[PDB]
Design a protein around this ligand. Structure first.
Ligand SMILES: O=c1ccn([C@@H]2O[C@H](COP(=O)(O)OP(=O)(O)O)[C@@H](O)[C@H]2O)c(=O)[nH]1
Length: 410
């Protein structure tokens, strides 16, 4: 019904739900053109494998050269978070190569709506405006986190992208309405000029986010059989965070001191060991880049020591695991106030990005999290209950995703 140009932000926390939403609007009949840079074209292979080439197009433009980004790196998950000001400045120069492409197409084939990252809306709206196309913006964070940020006096360098999202046709966020009704309504009322918000979450996968650095067949064979259900502790701080040698040693001491089973996800960083020094255990495994949803959904896994990024909370909530929160950056503190404080559905077991756990204190808390009766898990699971009715079918988000796809046609 609508031809949709999808322009995701080259970061995992963003692109991973932005493509599930791409699949979701695809399933209800949309046509989709995805604007992607060359190396990132391959993340589209999974989704491309599910849809007919007339329903799924791929526009690939070269990554704009920036002195500060290493060659071959087109995705912020491989950079220091401070590179985002450079990713922004570089990606904005996709503006007239995108204008060139659209202006050489038969006007009938132009899209009816652009579904671009809210992070890119300063220039995406200018394109959308040149061709008189509605620009709907997307965020992988919830309305609460949005409400705090948009309310600040001094925002920039995020100021332009926040001003641009308000002036967009509407906003799509990966959250369900019954988690945060006060904050949807406030953000809907005075942070979107035309008052159009779409809560469509939690978006569920369709080998996601990247090809895992250990075969996901093999990690399941480790997990089943793990002797004991609700006994394994998942440790993963997401895409962006890379712990220091100092903290990684203190966290590793806690996982050894609590004699719990666990899988520990460790990332890398690119510029221009540290996880020392053992497996004196076969009660563990290390990374790489891991298959989170398969672990968290697995029955043998019942805890998650997380950065409390917004995507990873929803995966751990859909997996039905206790959330042990250690916020570090970005929205993680918003989401500690919402999930640890207001709603009381996770325990804060770490303080700052540069916090260093007490290896003994953290070891008791890890062993206890492997307990079914914990009250913060039953409060979390009562949110899992509201979130499942919202996603399908007839819930807030099935209806928002139906209403979104319909609206894109006007
Ligand atoms: O080893 C990894 C690291 C991350 N992810 C996925 O990548 C996303 C991380 O984004 P999130 O919003 O949790 O945090 P961000 O990376 O934006 O800080 C989530 O969907 C995870 O399930 C994964 O599958 N394996």
């Amino acid at each position: 019904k609508p031809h949709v140009l999808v322009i995701p932000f080259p970061q995992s926390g963003h692109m991973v739900p932005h493509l599930d939403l791409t699949h979701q609007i695809l399933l209800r009949g949309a046509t989709v053109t995805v604007l992607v840079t060359p190396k990132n074209s391959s993340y589209l292979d999974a989704l491309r494998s599910l849809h007919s080439p007339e329903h799924f197009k791929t526009l690939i433009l070269p990554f704009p050269s920036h002195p500060c980004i290493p060659s071959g790196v087109e995705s912020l998950q491989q950079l220091p978070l401070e590179a985002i000001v450079h990713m922004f400045d570089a990606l904005s120069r996709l503006h007239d190569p995108l204008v060139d492409f659209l202006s050489r197409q038969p006007p009938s084939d132009l899209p009816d709506a652009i579904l671009g990252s809210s992070f890119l809306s300063p220039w995406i709206n200018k394109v959308a405006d040149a061709f008189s196309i509605k620009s709907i913006s997307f965020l992988p964070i919830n309305a609460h986190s949005i409400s705090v940020m948009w309310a600040q006096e001094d925002r920039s360098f995020f100021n332009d992208l926040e001003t641009a999202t308000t002036e967009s046709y509407g906003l799509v966020i990966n959250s369900f309405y019954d988690l945060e009704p006060e904050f949807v309504e406030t953000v809907k009322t005075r942070f979107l000029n035309h008052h159009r918000i779409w809560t469509v979450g939690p978006l569920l996968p369709f080998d996601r986010g990247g090809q895992s650095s250990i075969p996901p067949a093999k990690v399941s064979a480790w997990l089943d059989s793990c002797p004991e259900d609700n006994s394994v502790v998942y440790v993963g701080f997401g895409s962006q965070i890379r712990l220091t040698a100092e903290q990684t040693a203190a966290l590793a001491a806690a996982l050894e001191k609590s004699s719990v089973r666990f899988i520990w996800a460790v990332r890398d960083a690119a510029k221009k060991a540290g996880f020392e020094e053992r497996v004196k255990e076969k009660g563990l495994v290390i990374r790489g880049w891991a298959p989170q949803t398969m672990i968290l959904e697995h029955r043998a896994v019942g805890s998650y020591l997380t950065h409390l990024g917004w995507g990873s909370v929803l995966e751990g909530m859909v997996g039905g695991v206790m959330l042990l929160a250690w916020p570090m950056q970005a929205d993680h503190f918003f989401n500690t106030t919402l999930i640890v404080d207001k709603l009381r559905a996770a325990v804060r077991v770490g303080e700052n990005r540069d916090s260093v756990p007490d290896s003994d204190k953290l070891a008791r808390i890890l062993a206890e999290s492997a307990r079914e009766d914990l009250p913060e898990r039953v409060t979390l699971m009562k949110l899992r209950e509201k979130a499942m009715e919202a996603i399908k079918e007839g819930g807030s988000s099935y209806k928002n995703l139906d209403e979104l796809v319909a609206e894109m046609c006007l």
